[PDB]
Amino acid sequence: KTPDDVFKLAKDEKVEYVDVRFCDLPGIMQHFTIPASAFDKSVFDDGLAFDGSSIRGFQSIHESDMLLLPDPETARIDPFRAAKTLNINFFVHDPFTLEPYSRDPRNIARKAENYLISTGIADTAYFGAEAEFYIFDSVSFDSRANGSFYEVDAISGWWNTGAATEADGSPNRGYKVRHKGGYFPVAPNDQYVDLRDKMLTNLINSGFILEKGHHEVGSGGQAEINYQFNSLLHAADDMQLYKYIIKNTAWQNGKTVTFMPKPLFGDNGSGMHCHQSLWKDGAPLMYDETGYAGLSDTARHYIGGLLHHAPSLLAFTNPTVNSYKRLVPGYEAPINLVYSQRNRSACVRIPITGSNPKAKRLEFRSPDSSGNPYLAFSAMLMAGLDGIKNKIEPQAPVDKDLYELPPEEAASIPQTPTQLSDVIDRLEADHEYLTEGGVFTNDLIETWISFKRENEIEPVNIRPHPYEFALYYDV
């Protein structure tokens, strides 16, 4: 796509407004709107200014001014706004030198793709991401000196089977979803068919190649919609747009969506499994008919890299305090650093695909959607490429239900990290694999560590947990 392709699209669509978008460091898209009449060549030539102070992980107040330059390949019409709007993603640049910004997530993805080519290992990294989510009806929460609470609610939640009426006073008609029982009964047990169809249609209309949509395991409206894999930067751009469409399709239809890893205690969390393959000259590299699970040496060393760097890598792939509430046994999320074919209890699963080399890939099951896909996908690639470069051999595959291992035997396998502060500490101590080729820089890494400690870890740590009152009020 060219600047001229974008102007033509805006004209043909009778666009009233253009929405200017970019990513903050933690992973939330940011925006301002310009009139169509202000969308000209100058936007591409000179760019547009914003306040870098007000964006998390960006600039200080005395060095606030920053610049944005358009990415023509990201232009998509908005499905929700009454006034016809075209959305476009931008790269962040220095306002003096016009150089790409070191803490622009989209720049990191850019640099990662270029570094890959520079290695001669491959020219394309493909990412297929499964971002699960919950379709709720309501959420409320607070934090005070003498009390704190949260509650999420959903009509299909099993906690409501005993309700006398629904929230709007209408009768309880049953057909609510049992815990761990949402994957995937037909309607009327599935109460979200029509809404997911709206989501599917909005995605098709915005340029997604769709594969499938379904209710997920969790009670209270867990869902998943799958779309075709793409190369790293494109994939991460797709992910951000996907979350926007899912959240706003829900919002326009009276619902509220969360992508948080573990909103429900005692039911499945929400992961972001990443299917990954490396290709060169249009041909796949992950396949060897003689390998365990049909994997080549290249594929096996990529896995070796992921599982070796995991203790620090999870700082980018599982970046929140809530992340580590999902990494607990019995819910199809990982609890140790094992790879295994067909195995949804493992950290890396190899899906059963047959002899087709183009279908061969690994599934990294650890990641969730609580962070930044540009950083997550890039960190995973840097880990895998360190594995290949150093020929890191992964530990032998364990083809077992990993949650049913007796404690003496469970202890003999490297475990997933317990909490966020551990992965941040470990990232601080060893991150050289990430700074290879300048893909990540020290200033980015130091900012990330500093933001997570001051804004997430410490605020949670200092606040009494409601279960501490259950355990200790009467001590």
Ligand X SMILES: Nc1ncnc2c1ncn2[C@@H]1O[C@H](COP(=O)(O)OP(=O)(O)O)[C@@H](O)[C@H]1O
Ligand Y SMILES: C[S@](=O)(CC[C@H](N)C(=O)O)=NP(=O)(O)O
98 vs 117, which CB is nearer to its own copies?
A: 98
Tokens, residue 115? 């570094």
Amino acid letter for position 401: D
Check 78, 113, 237, 363 and give the catalytic one.
363
Tokens of 34: 């310009």
Give yes or no: 463 in active site: no
Position with the least CB separation from Cl ion: 421
What residue type is assigned to position 48 of the chain? L
Helix (H) or strand (E) run with residue 247 in it: helix 232-252
Contact indicator for 202, 196 with CB cutoff of 8 Å: no
Q: At its nearest, how many Å lie between ligand X and the CB of residue 312?
A: 24
Contact between 363 and ligand X per CB under 6 A:
yes
User: Residue 16 catalytic?
Assistant: no
Q: Which residues does 31 contact at the CB level (< 8 Å), separation at least 6? A: 19, 20, 21
Structure tokens of 2?
A: 């060219």
**Binding letters toward ligand Y, positions 1-40, x by CB under 6 A:** ----------------------------------------
Q: Which of 16, 344, 436, 453 is catalytic?
A: 344
Which position among 24, 132, 238, 456 bears the catalytic label? 132
Among the listed residues 76, 273, 308, 360, the single contact to Mg ion using CB under 5 A: 273
Candidate ranges 20-28, 121-129, 383-391, 433-441; the one touching its own copies (CB under 8 A):
20-28
What's at 226, amino acid-wise? N
Q: CA 41 to CA 26: how far, in whole Å? A: 31
Half-sphere exposure of 417 (CA within 13 A, CB side): 28
What secondary structure does DSSP assign to 92-104, as a single string?
EE-TTT-PBPTT-
- Integer angstrom CA distances of residue 383 from 324, 347, 380: 21, 15, 5
130 is in an annotated binding site: yes
Hey, which residues between 265 and 294 contact ligand X (CB under 6 A)?
Answer: 273, 275-277
Report the C-alpha gap between 223 and 19 in whole angstroms.
Answer: 28
- Residue placing its CB nearer to ligand X in the complex, 326 or 361: 361
Catalytic residue check, 103: no
For the record, the structure tokens of 279 come out as 């290709």
Binding Mg ion (rule: CB under 5 A), the pick from 24, 224, 267, 386 is 224
Query: Which amino acid, residue 228?
Result: Q
Q: In the window 435-454, what residues touch ligand X (CB under 6 A)?
A: none
Give DSSP secondary structure letters for 398-437. --S-TTSS-HHHHTTSPBPPSSHHHHHHHHHH--HHHHGG
Q: Phi, psi (5° rounding) for residue 119?
A: -80, -25
The residue number with the shortest CB distance to ligand Y is 271
CB 238 within 8 A of CB 374: no
Whether 274 contacts 367, CB under 8 Å: yes
Binding mask 106-145 for ligand X (x = CB under 6 A): --------------------x-x-x---------------
Nearest to 314 by CA among 393, 461, 427: 427
What character string, x for contact with ligand Y (CB under 6 A) and - otherwise, covers 268-307? xxxx-x----------------------------------
User: Which one of 24, 78, 104, 130 is in contact with Mg ion (CB under 5 A)?
Assistant: 130
| String of contacts with Cl ion for each residue 413-452, x by CB under 5 A | ------xxx-------------------------------
Contact pick of 234, 247, 389, 453 for its own copies (by CB under 8 A): 247
In 326-461, DSSP assigns E strands to 339-341, 348-350, 362-364
Q: Which does 201 bind (CB under 5 to 8 A by kind): ligand Y, Cl ion, its own copies, none?
A: its own copies
In the complex, minimum distance from the CB of residue 273 to Mg ion, in angstroms, rounded to a whole number: 4
Site map for ligand Y, 137-176, x if CB under 6 A? ----------------------------------------
| DSSP secondary structure letters along 55-68 | STTS--GGG-EEEE
| 48 interacts with Cl ion by CB under 5 A | no
- Picked from ligand Y, its own copies, ligand X, none, the partner binding residue 333 (CB below 5 to 8 A depending on kind) is ligand Y
Active site residue 365: yes
Rounded to a whole number of angstroms, the minimum distance from the CB of residue 325 to ligand Y is 11
CB 218 to its own copies: min, Å: 10
* Short-list 334, 350, 207, CA closest to 276: 350
For Mg ion, the closer CB: 273 or 426: 273
Cα distance between residue 299 and residue 305, in whole Å: 10
Known binding residues are 130, 132, 211, 216, 224, 227-229, 268-269, 273, 275-277, 326, 332, 344, 349, 358, 363, 365
- The binding site for ATP comprises 211, 227-229, 275-277, 344, 349, 358
Active-site residues: which are they? 51, 130, 132, 216, 224, 273, 344, 363, 365
